[PDB]
Subunit: 24 residues, 4 copies
């Protein structure tokens, strides 16, 4: 696997979750 792509994917999922919960 690609460490950078894994980290960016996880960070991206976390980003949407935190943004949603912030907008609620």
């Amino acid at each position: 696997s690609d460490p950078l792509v894994v980290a960016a994917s996880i960070i991206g999922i976390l980003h949407l979750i935190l943004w949603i919960l912030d907008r609620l």
Copy 2:
């Protein structure tokens, strides 16, 4: 990879929800 795919869809979805949240 299901992670890469899921994060790809989630990334596209994130921009959509952001634009609509801003407009």
Copy 3:
């Protein structure tokens, strides 16, 4: 990789650009 990953990449670059500009 595939057109999904490409599209999400382009869309992620676009997202940061538009967020920075919307934030200025």
Copy 4:
């Protein structure tokens, strides 16, 4: 892939700047 690497770097930077901007 260059585009994927750049988007990975940009995605990480995006979250960091968003969190900070929000605080």
